[PDB]
Design an enzyme around this catalytic site. Structure first.
Site, PDB file in Angstrom:
ATOM      1  CG  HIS B  40      -2.334  -0.837   0.420  1.00 17.54           C
ATOM      2  ND1 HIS B  40      -2.307  -2.215   0.263  1.00 17.54           N
ATOM      3  CD2 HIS B  40      -3.481  -0.413  -0.167  1.00 17.54           C
ATOM      4  CE1 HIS B  40      -3.414  -2.608  -0.339  1.00 17.54           C
ATOM      5  NE2 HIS B  40      -4.147  -1.536  -0.608  1.00 17.54           N
ATOM      6  CD  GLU B  71      -0.188  -4.026   2.159  1.00 12.27           C
ATOM      7  OE1 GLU B  71      -1.116  -4.378   1.344  1.00 12.27           O
ATOM      8  OE2 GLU B  71       0.283  -2.862   2.210  1.00 12.27           O
ATOM      9  N   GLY B 145       3.493   5.660  10.676  1.00 10.05           N
ATOM     10  CA  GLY B 145       4.907   6.014  10.698  1.00 10.05           C
ATOM     11  C   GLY B 145       5.744   4.755  10.893  1.00 10.05           C
ATOM     12  CB  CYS B 147       3.729   1.120   7.260  1.00 10.93           C
ATOM     13  SG  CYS B 147       2.115   0.593   7.868  1.00 10.93           S
TER      14      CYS B 147
END
Ligand SMILES: *[C@@H](CC(=O)OCC)[C@H](C[C@@H]1CCNC1=O)NC(=O)[C@H](Cc1ccccc1)NC(=O)OCc1ccccc1
Ligand SMILES: *[C@@H](CC(=O)OCC)[C@H](C[C@@H]1CCNC1=O)NC(=O)[C@H](Cc1ccccc1)NC(=O)OCc1ccccc1
Lengths: 188, 188
Positions: B40, B71, B145, B147
């Protein structure tokens, strides 16, 4: 390398989240029901400790003999549990240090460790407009939310975080003699 | 206790700050010029790496055989330095883990370590509206912050952080076979 284990043992047994009118701060408990917090947290007569409203029985905003801010406030708290006594981990004198860790315990960051590297006895700091003495400096870009954070090396608790300019961070020193049992007089 | 030393050695040699249209992410470099980033982050054909604009030579958004988001996006970068090869630290199989560390390397937090405790093979996650598979879960209140943040135990790099609900954090698994030299076909 950095004394992460030592930092973590201090955080586990000797920190609480403290909250004042100014917001949340990491709070180091030193012995009995005595703890510290940066003076600019502006401690009143009650404070939240881990979200529990708590009477502040005493608060002393430390200043040196030049009548200059040291940015440390020592508070005595009305609570049941005693803090583990960590005064033997406080340095006796001003000093420079290697490979320090900065540890934070707030609601946003319940447990976070930052190696800040070398820590130097910096002295005078104009701290966002307040002259301040006895400051430690590290070359790390510290942030809002980290005030009160505990600066350790292995075996030593050396200060609490109070400021930064975007490139350096600044801690107020902790010295053993701030907390010695002693005999006193009228202070308020 | 938590493998802070291992976490720190991974952060030091194998992370960069990556920045896309979506903002900054911790980026783990795995071998050669191959790195990972959460899908993402929406990687395009260029990306900033430590603020240096960098060609993305390849980007593969991993999905499993049910055609569900994992992901993880693997990217190949046009840069001079090779990453230290850390594929031998990747787990072969899904598993549960003890006492993990979550490490972050962004502009705001150039070097931060968070013990998140026990990590469980969680499986399916509705990740802010995207069905996602192969998720690890830890009981720690992770934040924006973080990820891309690297989840380790001693000797194992196990995932990268991708989500949280305020009480738990979620990482996408890394498995050794995502990165094996192999023989291939048309993928875009
Ligand atoms: C910590 C306190 C805070 O964020 O406010 C309420 C929780 C904060 C840390 C500081 C901010 C930017 N980077 C940092 O590491 N300290 C301050 O903001 C400090 C004033 C203060 C307030 C409450 C408690 C303690 C201290 N002021 C400050 O850092 O000013 C910037 C500065 C510092 C040194 C030289 C020049 C300018
Ligand atoms: C990390 C990405 C981010 O903050 O955005 C740009 C840098 C973020 C972490 C997450 C936010 C709250 N606590 C956390 O640990 N992840 C997300 O926001 C994630 C979507 C995303 C975006 C970019 C890259 C990777 C992932 N969405 C999310 O966490 O939604 C909340 C949620 C999670 C699980 C179940 C229900 C709801």
């Amino acid at each position: 390398g950095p004394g992460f284990d030592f930092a973590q043992a201090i955080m586990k047994k000797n920190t609480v989240v403290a909250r004042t009118e100014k917001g949340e701060f990491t709070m180091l408990g030193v012995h009995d029901r005595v703890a510290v917090i940066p003076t600019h947290a502006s401690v009143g007569e009650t404070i939240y400790i881990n979200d529990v409203e708590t009477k502040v029985l005493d608060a002393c905003a430390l200043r040196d003999l030049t009548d200059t801010n040291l940015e440390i406030t020592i508070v005595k708290l009305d609570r049941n549990q005693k803090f583990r006594d960590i005064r033997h981990f406080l340095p006796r004198y001003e000093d420079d240090y290697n490979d320090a860790v900065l540890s934070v315990h707030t609601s946003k960051f319940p447990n976070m460790y930052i190696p800040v590297g070398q820590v130097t006895n910096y002295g005078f700091l104009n701290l966002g407009g307040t002259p301040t003495h006895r400051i430690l400096m590290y070359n790390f870009p510290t942030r809002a939310g980290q005030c009160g954070g505990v600066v350790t090396t292995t075996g030593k608790v050396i200060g609490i975080h109070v400021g930064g300019n975007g490139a350096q961070g600044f801690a107020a020193m902790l010295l053993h003699s701030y907390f010695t049992d002693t005999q006193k007089h009228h202070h308020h």
